Amino acid sequence: ELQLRPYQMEVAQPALDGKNIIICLPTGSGKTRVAVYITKDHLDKKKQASESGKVIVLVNKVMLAEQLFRKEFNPYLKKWYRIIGLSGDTQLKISFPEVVKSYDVIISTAQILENSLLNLESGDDDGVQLSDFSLIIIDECHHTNKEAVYNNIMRRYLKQKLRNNDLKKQNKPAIPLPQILGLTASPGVGAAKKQSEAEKHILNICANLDAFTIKTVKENLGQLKHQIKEPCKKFVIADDTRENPFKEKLLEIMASIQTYCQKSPMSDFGTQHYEQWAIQMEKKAAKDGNRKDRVCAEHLRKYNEALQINDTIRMIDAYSHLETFYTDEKEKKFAVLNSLKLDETDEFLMNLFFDNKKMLKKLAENPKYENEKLIKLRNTILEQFTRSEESSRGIIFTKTRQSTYALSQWIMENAKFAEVGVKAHHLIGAGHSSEVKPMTQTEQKEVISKFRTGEINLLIATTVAEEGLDIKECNIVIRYGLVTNEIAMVQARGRARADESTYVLVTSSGSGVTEREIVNDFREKMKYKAINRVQNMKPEEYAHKILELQVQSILEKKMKVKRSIAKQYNDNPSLITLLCKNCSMLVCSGENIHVIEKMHHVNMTPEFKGLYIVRENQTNGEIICKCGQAWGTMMVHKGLDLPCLKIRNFVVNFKNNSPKKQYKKWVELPIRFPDLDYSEYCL
RNA sequence: GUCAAGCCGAGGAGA
RNA sequence: UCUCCUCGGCUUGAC
Ligand SMILES: Nc1ncnc2c1ncn2[C@@H]1O[C@H](COP(=O)(O)OP(=O)(O)O)[C@@H](O)[C@H]1O
Ligand code: ALF
Ligand SMILES: [Zn+2]
């Protein structure tokens, strides 16, 4: 029951036979269908050729793999060929390399494949080789770039093509290369002011893929334009003259502390540059071993955060955020006391805070000066849903997660949204961060299905949503004051697959966001022109340029290796001393340390044992200092109750000359630690 | 079916 | 070089 459209056939017509190429079309144009048709066509040809038919599909996003398998690939081609869909969530009970020769149609996230190849290179596993496949297919190719995943693969394929070309003039024998396909919407630009630079960027993309041409549709192009609708754009701006009662109270607190510090930011409060200054000051303070400065740097940073959320989010959210933090600090102090101890700074800060904290709590619940951009957002939602009369499938984007969760709660709480019957759910990535609850991959998938069901007419999400999530109908899409690049803008702007679609943006009049909007708009215009230039490029000249770029990429890789051969070759097990960071309290040396899984660094001596504290919530306990610094988390490996930690929380002190430093992660530093022989700790 | 923790890589933004 | 955010992956464990 497979189908096709005219332009679809037109654009793909070359690839139907050889011609490893790219395809560039607007969103929701049946790209997936194009791929599917090509898969079937490709295999049928291999079968009639009595030749092996293997295919593989690649998606950067995990959600996307399931999507394609669920809705497009598995349905049509189920009967003819075997199919299967893999992801981190999926369990490869078999293995990757085996199924490569089992289901004959693979769908996978990228890094899975690369992981397999890399293992093959190591010899640790049988792994897999490109030759095993006959056709490699890709989505969102635009990602292919400097150190992008896809690029890691292509650089291999390119290398082999170069070998094949070398043989072409030396020896008849060669190694087969699978046909490569490319599927995207906006190949994008590398922030090129000049369209010629953009042209170059494209050429780089194509060469990173052995694209013989962009091959965008021209003849039926009008038909496609007619078929496909573009949302009615809409800008929404809001100036923040309010927040004087509450925000200003905060700025007052910040200044009070800075006065406690005698440190001049020379930067506006609530800004990243201000935050960055806080960090470097904190780093310097800690490296110096000095206090009263790094600690305050920490708190101020917390407050700049609180400001930025208070800018977007209401006073309540930020106040709560500060309150949680200080609550944690108090609990640490109490655990330490559990003896007698006193502090001057912390006492200054907590007595500075707790009372003003009550004040801000009182100031927190105010509807009038709650926000401006949030309100505008409400107005847009309420208007559109009221206007749709049950015909609204809504999406939202932001930058962070804490944002998403807050919005979903506040929207559900708001009677106005409740009145219209809108239902809000927040979506995020699997990993846990930003002090938010992680979502199980299944939970995300469930949520997606519920929206596809319409159970949720308003799904909050993050960049993860910007891609894929092919939905039959969506009328509404917005952006909550977030500008990253033209590509993200267009993909998101191309997600309301409805005859009538609305694109909205919400920005502070003060922030130069609409600026960047216009930027990306120009880039969008620039690229289509650049594409038209190359499409008219000479084949041979095109060929020469791409070859040059292919080589360039590879040699670049070689040097990035050369500077990475070792680049920090210290075999110095214990030539150091780790102190606490808040307090300059010695903790351990390098010798008392060992490793498990060659990943986790730990010490397991009673000397380190009788120093920390376990703050409760129960198995995975958290660790803290006697100063109140947090140190690490418990760990139960093979029964051993080893407490593991994070290097970032501690500070370096060499034996030689003590140029104290921070590394933020173990791998960065040169020296090695050993694994732990469990011969120890026996009877 | 549930949860936690940790490590690594990559991209984007800003500086 | 630093920072923030985001994504992907790999391990350990417990329930
Ligand atoms: N032959 C066809 N005729 C009509 N509609 C089609 C055809 N093939 C695909 N589509 C439509 O295209 C949509 C899928 O678009 P897709 O290519 O996945 O989005 P994108 O191009 O942004 O990745 C489906 O909802 C389907 O309705
Ligand atoms: F391939 Al698309 F939006 F164009 F997922
Ligand atoms: Zn300490």
Q: Whose CA is nearest to atom 3 of ligand 2?
A: A27
Q: What tokens does A500 get?
A: 């009538």
AA letter at A116: S
Same domain, A80 and A187: yes
A80 torsion bin: left (phi>0), alpha (psi -120 to 50), beta (else): alpha
Distance CA A602, CA A634 (A): 10
Same domain, A215 and A314: no
Longest dimension (CA), chain A: 85
Number of CB atoms found within 10 A of residue A63's CB: 22
The crossing angle, in degrees rounded to 10, of helices A294-312 and A345-364 is 10
Q: What tokens does A449 get?
A: 């299905």
Q: Are A643 and A602 in contact (CB under 8 A)?
A: yes
Give SS3 for A265.
Answer: coil
Number of CB atoms found within 10 A of residue A391's CB: 14
Same domain, A280 and A351: yes
AA letter at A73: F
Please provide the distance, in angstroms rounded to a whole number, between the alpha carbons at the two ends of chain A.
70
Distance CA A300, CA A60 (A): 37
Same domain, A260 and A145: no
Same domain, A308 and A208: no
Q: Are A506 and A373 in contact (CB under 8 A)?
A: yes
| Concatenated DSSP letters of A144-189 | --TT-HHHHHHHHHHHHHHHHHHHHTT-S------EE-EEES----
Environment class of A347 (CB within 10 Å of its CB; exposed 0-12, middle 13-18, buried 19+) = exposed
The rounded Å distance from CA A58 to ligand 3 centre is 47
A65 membership: H or E segment, kind and range: helix A62-68
Number of CB atoms found within 10 A of residue A15's CB: 25
Q: Are A397 and A507 in contact (CB under 8 A)?
A: no
Q: Whose CA is nearest to atom 5 of ligand 2?
A: A468
Same domain, A217 and A254: no
Distance CA A58, CA A113 (A): 9
AA letter at A482: L
Same domain, A208 and A269: no
Q: What is the resolution of this structure in A?
A: 4.3
Q: Give how far Cα A211 sits from Cα of A16, A59, A233, A638, Å.
A: 14, 18, 34, 51
The experimental technique behind this entry is cryo-EM
| Concatenated DSSP letters of A496-528 | --SSS-EE-EEEESSSTHHHHHHHHHHHHHHHH
In sequence order, which residues have a C-beta less than 8 Å from that of residue A490 and are 6 or more positions away? Answer: A27, A185, A186, A520, A524
AA letter at A383: E
User: What is the domain range of residue A313?
Assistant: 245-364
Instruction: Strands of A249-313 (E only): list them.
Output: none
Give SS3 for A222.
Answer: helix
Residue A315's Cβ-side half-sphere holds a number of Cα atoms within 13 Å equal to 24
| Concatenated DSSP letters of A535-564 | HTS-HHHHHHHHHHHHHHHHHHHHHHHHTT
Q: Which of A13, A22, A17, A12 has the alpha carbon at shortest distance from A154? A: A22
Residues A455, A457, A463, A466, Cα dihedral to 10°: 110
Measure the CA angle with vertex A216, ends A213 and A219; round to 5°: 125
**Which residue's alpha carbon is at the shortest distance from the C1' of B2?**
A440
Closest nucleotide (C1' vs CA) to A485 is B12
Q: What tokens does A106 get?
A: 């693979």
User: Based on C-alpha coordinates, what's the Rg of chain A?
Assistant: 29
Three-state secondary structure readout of A330-399: HHHHHHHHCCCCCCCHHHHHHHHHHHHHHHHHHHHCCCCCCCCHHHHHHHHHHHHHHHHCCCCCEEEECC
Ligand nearest to the CA of A35: 1
Distance CA A662, CA A650 (A): 8
Same domain, A252 and A219: no
Is the C-alpha dihedral spanning A443, A448, A452, A454 positive or negative?
positive
In sequence order, which residues have a C-beta less than 8 Å from that of residue A602 and are 6 or more positions away? Answer: A593, A594, A595, A596, A635, A642, A643, A644, A645, A676
Distance CA A400, CA A409 (A): 15
Same domain, A258 and A164: no
Give SS3 for A671.
Answer: coil
Same domain, A114 and A30: yes
Q: Which of A5, A22, A32 to mutate to test the pocket of ligand 1 (most atoms within 8 A of CB)?
A: A32
Environment class of A251 (CB within 10 Å of its CB; exposed 0-12, middle 13-18, buried 19+) = middle
Distance CA A403, CA A571 (A): 45
Distance CA A187, CA A487 (A): 8
Q: What tokens does A304 get?
A: 């700049």
Q: Are A435 and A519 in contact (CB under 8 A)?
A: no
Q: What tokens does A131 get?
A: 């030759």
The rounded Å distance from CA A629 to ligand 3 centre is 5
Q: Are A220 and A7 in contact (CB under 8 A)?
A: yes
Distance CA A542, CA A431 (A): 43
Distance CA A404, CA A621 (A): 28
Strand A593-596 versus strand A630-633 pairing type: unpaired
Q: Are A289 and A584 in contact (CB under 8 A)?
A: yes
Q: CA–C1' distance A607–B1 (Å)? A: 41
Q: What tokens does A676 get?
A: 């732990």
Same domain, A134 and A279: no
Residues 274-333 of A with CB under 7 A from strand B: 276
Long-range contacts of A294-298, Cβ-Cβ distance < 8 Å, separation of 24 or more? A294/A581, A294/A582, A295/A345, A295/A346, A295/A349, A295/A582, A296/A257, A296/A260, A296/A261, A296/A263, A296/A345, A296/A349
Q: Are A198 and A530 in contact (CB under 8 A)?
A: yes
Q: Are A611 and A603 in contact (CB under 8 A)?
A: no
Same domain, A141 and A26: yes
